[PDB]
C-alpha cells in the first residue's frame, strides 16, 4: 500500500499543444521571462504582462487543446490509490483537472485564476483581465494579477508538499527540466526520507543515483506504461 507523490512539469503537457512555460535561454518561447514572469516585469509594464497572460489563458481553452494519455494515466493512478496519492504540478494549465485528477497542488499557481494583488485571494477567472477588473475582497478594490507564481516569488502549498515528501514511498518526477527550484530539489528530499525515486521524461534532467529508476521518451508513451505497470503491481 505505498504512498505515491507525483511532481509534473511542462514536459507532460508539451504533447497537448500548450504554449510553454518551460524556461529556455531566459525565454518562454518568444517572451523574456524577465519581462512576463517576474514581479518587476509586471511592475514595469502591467499592460503588456496582462496581455501576455490574457493570450495564454485564451490559448489554453481552445478546442484543439486536450489532456493527453499521460494526463489520463495519472488520473487512473489517483483512482487506484486515493488518499495515498498526491499530485504536485509546476504547470499552470488545467489539463490534470480535465483528466480527472483532484486536489492538484499547483505550486506555481493557475492560469485560470487571478489574484487580488493586495489580499492575495485567488478566484476562478476564464476571460481577459482589463484595467477595470478589480477585486471584491477589499475595502478599496485593487487591481487583479494572474494567479501564476513568478520567478522570485514563493511557491504555493510548500508545507503540504514537504510533509507529503517526507512520507512518500514512491516519488515520480514527470516532464520536469531540473532547472526550476525548489521543485527540482524535491527528488533529493524524497531520497533523504527513503522513497523510491522515478524520472519519466523526454530527456534526462539530473545525472546520477538520485533517480533510482528512469525511463525516457515521449510523455504520452512512457507515462502510461509506467503507471499501468505500477497498477498491476498492486494486484
Amino acid at each position: 500500500k505505498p504512498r505515491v507523490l507525483v511532481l509534473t512539469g511542462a514536459g507532460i503537457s508539451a504533447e497537448s499543444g500548450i504554449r510553454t512555460f518551460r524556461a529556455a535561454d531566459g525565454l518562454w518561447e518568444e517572451h523574456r521571462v524577465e519581462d512576463v514572469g517576474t514581479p518587476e516585469g509586471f511592475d514595469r509594464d502591467p499592460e503588456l504582462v496582462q496581455a501576455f497572460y490574457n493570450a495564454r489563458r485564451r490559448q489554453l481553452q481552445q478546442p484543439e487543446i486536450q489532456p493527453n494519455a499521460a494526463h489520463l494515466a495519472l488520473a487512473k493512478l489517483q483512482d487506484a490509490l486515493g488518499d495515498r496519492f498526491l499530485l504536485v504540478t509546476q504547470n499552470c494549465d488545467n489539463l490534470h483537472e480535465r483528466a480527472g485528477n483532484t486536489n492538484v497542488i499547483h505550486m506555481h499557481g493557475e492560469l485560470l485564476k487571478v489574484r487580488c494583488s493586495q489580499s492575495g485571494q485567488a478566484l476562478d477567472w476564464t476571460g481577459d483581465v482589463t484595467p477595470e477588473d478589480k477585486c471584491h475582497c477589499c475595502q478599496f478594490p485593487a487591481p487583479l494579477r494572474p494567479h501564476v507564481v513568478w520567478f522570485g516569488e514563493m511557491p504555493l502549498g510548500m508545507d503540504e508538499i514537504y510533509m507529503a515528501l517526507s512520507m512518500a514511498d514512491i516519488f515520480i518526477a514527470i516532464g520536469t527540466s531540473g532547472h526550476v527550484y525548489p521543485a527540482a530539489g524535491f527528488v533529493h528530499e524524497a531520497k533523504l526520507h527513503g522513497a523510491h525515486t522515478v524520472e519519466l521524461n523526454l530527456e534526462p534532467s539530473q545525472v546520477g543515483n538520485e533517480f533510482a529508476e528512469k525511463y525516457y521518451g515521449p510523455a504520452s508513451q512512457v507515462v502510461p506504461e509506467f503507471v499501468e505497470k505500477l497498477l498491476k503491481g498492486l494486484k
Binding site: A23, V33, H108, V149, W150, F151, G152, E153, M154, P155, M158, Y162, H179, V180, Y181, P182, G185
Partner: peptide, 7 residues
C-alpha cells in the same frame, strides 16, 4: 525551500 528560481 526558498523562492521560485532558475539554475
Amino acid at each position: 525551500g526558498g523562492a521560485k528560481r532558475h539554475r
